[PDB]
Design a protein around this ligand. Structure first.
Ligand SMILES: Nc1ncnc2c1ncn2[C@@H]1O[C@H](COP(=O)(O)OP(=O)(O)NP(=O)(O)O)[C@@H](O)[C@H]1O
Ligand SMILES: Nc1ncnc2c1ncn2[C@@H]1O[C@H](COP(=O)(O)OP(=O)(O)NP(=O)(O)O)[C@@H](O)[C@H]1O
Ligand SMILES: [Mg+2]
Ligand SMILES: [Mg+2]
Ligand SMILES: [Zn+2]
Lengths: 440, 576, 284
């Protein structure tokens, strides 16, 4: 309808003005245009993305922010189109070989408070939501169509530039120009993009006593691919929507990702250079390690050396030397052994904590099992694979069985795991430190 | 008159305009006029509590509905899907009359019935019961995820319940049924729960059954209306609870009310009381968590009521588990891995210490476990987690429970010529994880024998089927659940010099006799006991009296560890 | 600059009125919010992120409900400044921010460094400092309230007859923050308001209050401050200057007069008993 087209056009103009007029600063110093400059610098580097902030847009015009909160699917595409046409006038004219205009992805960010998965009343269908949690499963990458062309089997008529919806929903072809299923897709004319799927787990402290944790399904697209891995704690922003006779599944379409925990800024390098320069840094670091635990200064010093580690080497005749360090603590009960392990797992950039009594050989190194889909055998990584490059804390170390402690002799020295089972033979990496505690 | 059933089925009758309006007015008037025995309005309070917390769900009791408006109580189980609809329509306008702005929060309110008298066993359902309101019991075994269902969309979840183990006959097999949970009932349960379920019995066609049996046989399911396990305190409850705290002798009343039929044994009752209320967990500076719970161990001669105390604790507390010696395995205590029946993948499931969570885990014949099974509880008792790495799984689970255990001395009888460690045969990493340690012994005083025997004979004539005064057990149960949920003691200051001096002296003597080794854990234990005594008095801040009580309990239980000839000198050394 | 719920918990007046250090007080607060018809999810969200439909009419709702509950004085006459697209402040936010920067408890060098930061923040070119100062103020308010609760529940406020007496002690929550005369005096004022609203005893509701706090335990010194009686229409005139001087001289106390207000002084710890006896007997 023409009224709908007029409304779309008007809203697109308002988004465009927000991008090309917004400024920060004071007249006592000077003003800068926040989003124009970012579009220019990102386009000239071959990026094609920007990260708009809801707080800013809400301040420039409350109505636009309101619409983009209640009707995100309908309005976000107007914003993406606006960003594209601004990028053009901000960069044009481009050199030879650059004359064709590319498409921009717009990501969203905000300062407001999260809500738990359990808070999602079904009144929230298609509304914009912000959720925290842990990633527990992650797919490999696939190709997804954005626009296609098709041709007729019997009489070779065609239809072209057929638009495909984003998210986890499909499409159906026409039957006119013939047989009942007359058209087929042309793969050479498919404009495809990367896409991936994930599963999210509700936070351990948010779930009450006497209930299950809820879990949720996520869709991931273009520049967001391979940004995270399982076990990480993250904050997600996205659209919430649907995918006995009346049951239907549901999932979230992600629009922005923040890892609750990136490249170091220049300022941060200056501070680290200062820390490296000042003369008694060894004692400073030693006092930072496990500050609540009384005494044990030598033990804290040894732990510091474990976290920094030696250096890896490759020799001229092709052999390797391991570089990293293994440490064992043995003796009396009630002496804070378990507390130190519990700290080092949080202090290290990569770390895992497991109990010797509650673990198996196939669980420590790696395992082989049949795929729940298809019928094929597939590989799985144990604790010493997930902690590759980091520290592994083995608690209750003296309570493993003999045949299970035997399983880690390759991993602790040669830093690799050799497997030969079920008709598959491969070698995996495990470049990690072992920290262990035991009794007499 | 509404009762005039003529020429129509009740389903048709309540569909008629006249009867529908009479039912509507009668339930509305019942809501506004219903009074308790004190002359208090019941539903004014209940509706106001519902509105203040935004909960959108109203519970009604069948017994007093019947007592005041029997005609509606008579129709209700015969046509539930009709009367429950009318009831919902009537309740929403009472809510809006009292709280005119409440339509901003919700546009519907659900009435849920309770204490329905006509309970049925889960294998005695027949076609006689179809499309009527029923009540049953069982344990949940399967439970889907919460999913959205068309209507607008609302939450939906499906479960499977079966007969409670030990209510089936020996060596035979249990029956089971499916049930459906909608809207605010989802996540009212999880696997392994035992529940009481009220709902509508309903049936539908299924081609698979007809082709499997060869006869036109239908499938059935239960629509849930109210679910409850087998706080909601009134103003009168909190008023009586708080008023009781004024009594300067409240400690005697609470202690004397534990396992009332057991004569004597003051120390055991006191220790169990402190463990029942518990200290408070904390994490100073965010990087240094420490547990709140107080663990207990009992040891001594046979025939001294050790097994009986655990059974009482199981009855009075909530979220309780009981297990014995050789009857438990390491994997059953902590957590286990399996090939899932229908998802066809490896999955991890909870054992005893995980299933108990913020509850009590009771162990008996602790002397007779296999040592490889007994060493499984070391992480859960101190770090309060269970960490597992098996079959590609790598994860950790919460284990926030209190452990209580009973054991026997070596050779069947305790010898006062030997210390506790010499008589019990448990290693130091186990012994040091229990906050309170007790020793129980036979005695041979004739007057004590006569009093005990006379009391037992009196107990037998008292319970035929037919110190200060203790509380009724229901009052005590209300008291405990209030104190654990509404009071959180703060340790704002205490005398560091006094405790430090005493601890150093105590540890020095512990080195001399070697009855038990004394470690950093003992100080933290006294802090827990001090907070527990503060909680029994319903006080928000710890005071000097609490610290003195904690020190007394600690030292009194320590002196018993020594040889008989040494105890006199030790007692005079630690004069308090 | 934070949630509606935080404001109601941490404002001195409403915290006193609803008695929010007691768990029954929280039930009363929920009844208030229920009367207005604010969903609890909205009330726990930041004011900037609340629903626009509620924000536009909030002041009328709060005044009407407060008036019904007997809180007759919820509005005030004030001014506000606005510049750029999204910088807006009430005249009081600037005061709490500046005050927090100046009286900051941390020994981040000499005290003049705190003064310097306070002065610089009053210029528009140094706006980032203003936003930093607000974060200091939030912590200051929270510390004040939990201190008042501890003081009442532990029952430290004691009648001496002609005046109420109270003292803090070392190691207990946030005592370092109340070592300076500015923060100490403001804390003591809030404490007196809380106490008079709490108690029913009429003879307690019209008294001045004297408060003492640790200054330097290695010097063996304590700071002492006196407040006039609490009434709404009081002239804010107070008599503790000449009272402290006469009592100290009659006692021959080891004391020092240092701050520009005459109602705050420094005392040696050992002299406090006879000094209090002199004050009690002098006020009579
Ligand atoms: N130096 C210390 N500082 C603080 N807490 C300590 C110290 N030494 C022991 N603890 C306490 O000791 C308790 C047990 O800690 P834990 O880490 O299990 O020691 P441990 O040597 O591993 N005991 P165990 O597992 O029996 O061998 C905790 O409550 C700690 O707070
Ligand atoms: N003081 C007592 N008062 C009442 N009943 C008692 C008392 N002492 C023993 N009994 C009874 O003696 C029986 C055995 O109780 P029980 O708790 O098993 O003792 P026990 O010491 O644990 N026996 P054991 O498990 O072999 O060590 C029960 O019927 C008790 O009720
Ligand atoms: Mg340990
Ligand atoms: Mg027994
Ligand atoms: Zn054709």
């Amino acid at each position: 309808a023409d009224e709908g087209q007029a409304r779309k056009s008007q809203l697109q103009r308002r988004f465009k003005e927000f991008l090309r007029q917004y400024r920060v600063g004071t007249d006592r110093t000077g003003f800068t245009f926040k989003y124009r400059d970012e579009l220019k610098r990102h386009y000239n580097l071959g990026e094609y993305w920007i990260e708009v902030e809801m707080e800013d847009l809400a301040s420039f015009d409350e109505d636009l922010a309101d619409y983009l909160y209640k009707q995100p699917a309908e309005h976000l595409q107007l914003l993406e189109e606006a960003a594209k046409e601004v990028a053009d006038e901000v960069t044009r004219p481009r050199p030879s070989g650059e004359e064709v205009l590319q498409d921009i992805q717009v990501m969203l960010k905000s300062d407001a408070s999260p809500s738990s998965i359990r808070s999602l009343k079904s009144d929230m269908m298609s509304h914009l939501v912000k959720i925290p949690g842990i990633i527990i499963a992650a797919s490999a990458v696939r190709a997804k169509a954005t626009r296609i062309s098709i041709q007729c089997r019997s009489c070779r008529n065609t239809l072209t530039n057929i638009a495909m919806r984003p998210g986890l929903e499909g499409y159906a072809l026409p039957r006119k120009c013939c047989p009942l299923d007359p058209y087929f897709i042309m793969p050479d004319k498919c404009k495809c993009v990367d896409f991936q799927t994930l599963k999210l787990q509700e936070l351990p402290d948010a779930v009450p006593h006497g209930e299950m944790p809820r879990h949720m399904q996520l869709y991931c697209d273009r520049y967001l691919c391979d940004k995270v891995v399982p076990g990480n704690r993250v904050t997600i922003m996205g659209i919430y929507s649907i995918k006995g006779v009346g049951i239907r599944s549901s999932y979230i379409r992600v629009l922005g990702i923040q890892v609750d925990t990136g490249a170091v800024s220049p300022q941060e390098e200056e501070e680290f250079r200062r820390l490296a320069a000042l003369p008694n840094v060894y004692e400073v670091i030693s006092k930072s390690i496990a500050p609540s635990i009384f005494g044990g200064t030598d033990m804290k010093k040894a732990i510091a050396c474990l976290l920094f580690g030696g250096s890896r080497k490759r020799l001229p005749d092709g052999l390797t030397r391991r570089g990293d360090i293994n440490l064992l603590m043995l003796g009396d009960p009630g002496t804070a052994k378990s507390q130190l392990l519990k700290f080092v797992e949080k202090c290290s950039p990569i770390g895992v904590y497991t109990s010797g009594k509650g673990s198996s050989a196939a669980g420590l190194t790696a395992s082989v099992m049949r795929d729940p889909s298809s019928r094929n055998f597939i590989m799985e990584g144990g604790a010493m694979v997930l902690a590759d490059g980091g520290v592994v804390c083995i608690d209750e170390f003296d309570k493993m069985r003999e045949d299970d402690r035997v399983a880690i002799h390759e991993a602790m020295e040669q830093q690799t795991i050799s497997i030969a089972k079920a008709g598959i033979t491969t070698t995996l990496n495990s470049r990690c430190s072992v920290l262990a505690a035991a009794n007499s | 008159n509404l009762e005039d059933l003529k020429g129509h089925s009740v389903r048709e009758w309540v569909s008629m305009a006249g009867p529908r309006l009479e039912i509507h007015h009668r339930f509305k008037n019942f809501l506004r006029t219903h009074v308790d025995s004190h002359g208090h309005n019941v539903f004014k309070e209940r509706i106001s509590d519902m509105c203040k917390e935004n909960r959108e769900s109203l519970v009604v009791n069948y017994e007093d509905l019947a007592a005041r408006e029997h005609v509606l109580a008579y129709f209700l189980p015969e046509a539930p899907a009709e009367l429950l609809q009318i009831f919902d329509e009537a309740a929403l306008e009472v809510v809006l009359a009292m709280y005119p702005k409440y339509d901003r929060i919700t546009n519907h309110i659900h009435v849920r019935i309770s204490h329905l008298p006509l309970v049925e066993e889960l294998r005695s359902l027949r076609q006689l019961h179809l499309n009527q309101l029923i009540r049953t019991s069982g344990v949940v075994t399967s439970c889907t995820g919460v999913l959205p269902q068309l209507s607008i969309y609302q939450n939906y979840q499906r479960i499977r319940i079966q007969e409670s183990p030990g209510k089936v006959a020996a060596g035979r097999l249990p029956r089971s049924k499916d049930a459906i949970l909608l809207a605010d009932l989802v996540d009212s349960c999880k696997p392994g729960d035992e529940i009481e379920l009220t709902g509508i019995y309903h049936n539908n066609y299924d081609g698979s059954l007809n082709t499997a049996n060869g006869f036109p046989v239908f499938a059935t399911v239960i629509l849930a209306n109210h679910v409850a396990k087998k706080g909601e305190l009134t103003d009168e409850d909190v008023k009586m609870i708080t008023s009781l705290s004024k009594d300067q002798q409240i400690g005697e009343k609470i202690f004397a009310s534990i396992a009332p039929s057991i004569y004597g044994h003051e120390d055991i009752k006191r220790g169990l009381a402190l463990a029942l209320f518990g200290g408070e967990p904390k994490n100073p500076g965010g990087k240094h968590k420490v547990r709140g719970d107080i663990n207990v161990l009992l040891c001594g001669d046979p025939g001294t009521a050790k097994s009986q105390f655990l059974k009482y604790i199981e009855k009075v507390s909530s979220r309780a588990i009981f297990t014995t010696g050789q009857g438990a395995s390491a994997v059953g205590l902590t957590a286990y891995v399996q090939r899932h029946p229908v998802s066809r993948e490896w999955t991890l499931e909870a054992g005893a210490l995980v299933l108990a969570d913020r509850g009590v885990c009771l162990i008996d014949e602790f002397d007779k476990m296999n040592d490889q099974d007994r060493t499984s509880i070391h992480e859960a008792m101190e770090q309060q987690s269970i960490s597992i790495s098996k079959a590609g799984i790598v994860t950790s689970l919460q284990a926030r429970c209190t452990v209580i255990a009973a054991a026997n001395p070596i050779g069947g009888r305790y010898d006062p010529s030997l210390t506790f460690s010499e008589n019990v045969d448990l290693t130091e990493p186990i012994i040091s994880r229990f906050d309170i340690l007790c020793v129980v012994r036979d005695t041979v005083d004739p007057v004590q024998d006569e009093m005990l025997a006379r009391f037992v004979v009196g107990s037998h004539v008292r319970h035929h089927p037919s110190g200060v005064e203790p509380l009724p057990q229901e009052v005590l149960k209300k008291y405990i659940i209030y104190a654990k949920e509404r009071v959180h003691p703060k340790l704002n200051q205490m005398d560091q010099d006094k405790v430090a001096k005493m601890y150093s002296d105590l540890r020095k003597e512990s080195m001399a006799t070697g009855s038990i080794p004394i470690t950093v854990r003992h100080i933290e234990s006294m802090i827990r006991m001090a907070e527990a005594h503060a909680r029994i008095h319903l006080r928000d801040y710890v005071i000097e009296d609490d610290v003195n009580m904690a020190i007394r309990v600690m030292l009194e239980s320590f002196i018993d560890t020594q040889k008989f000839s040494v105890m006199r000198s030790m007692r005079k050394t630690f004069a308090r | 600059h934070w949630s509606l719920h935080d404001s109601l918990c941490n404002t001195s007046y409403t915290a006193a009125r609803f008695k929010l250090w007691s768990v029954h007080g929280q039930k009363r607060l929920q009844e208030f919010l229920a009367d207005m018809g604010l969903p609890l999810k909205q009330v726990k969200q930041k004011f900037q992120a609340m629903d626009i439909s509620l924000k536009e009419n909030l002041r009328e709702m709060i005044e009407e409900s407060a008036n019904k509950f007997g809180m007759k004085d919820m509005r005030v006459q004030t001014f506000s400044i606005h510049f750029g697209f999204k910088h807006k402040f009430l005249a009081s936010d600037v005061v709490f921010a500046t005050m927090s920067l100046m009286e900051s408890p941390e020994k981040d060098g000499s005290g003049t460094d705190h003064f310097i930061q306070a002065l610089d923040s009053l210029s528009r070119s140094n706006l980032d400092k203003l936003y930093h100062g607000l974060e200091l103020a939030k912590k200051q308010l929270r510390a004040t309230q939990q201190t008042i609760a501890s003081c009442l529940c532990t029952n430290l406020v004691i009648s001496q007859g002609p005046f109420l007496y109270c003292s803090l002690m070392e190691g207990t929550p946030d005592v370092m923050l109340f070592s300076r005369p500015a923060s100490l005096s403001l804390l003591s004022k809030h404490l007196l308001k809380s106490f008079v609203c709490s108690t029913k005893n009429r003879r307690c509701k019209l008294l001045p209050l004297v408060m003492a706090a640790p200054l330097s335990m290695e010097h063996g010194t304590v700071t002492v401050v006196g407040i006039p009686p609490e009434t709404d229409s009081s002239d804010r005139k107070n008599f503790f200057g000449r009272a402290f001087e006469k009592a100290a001289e009659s006692t021959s106390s080891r004391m020092l007069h240092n701050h520009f207000d005459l109602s705050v002084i420094e005392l040696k710890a050992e002299d406090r008993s006879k000094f209090l006896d002199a004050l009690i007997s002098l006020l009579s």
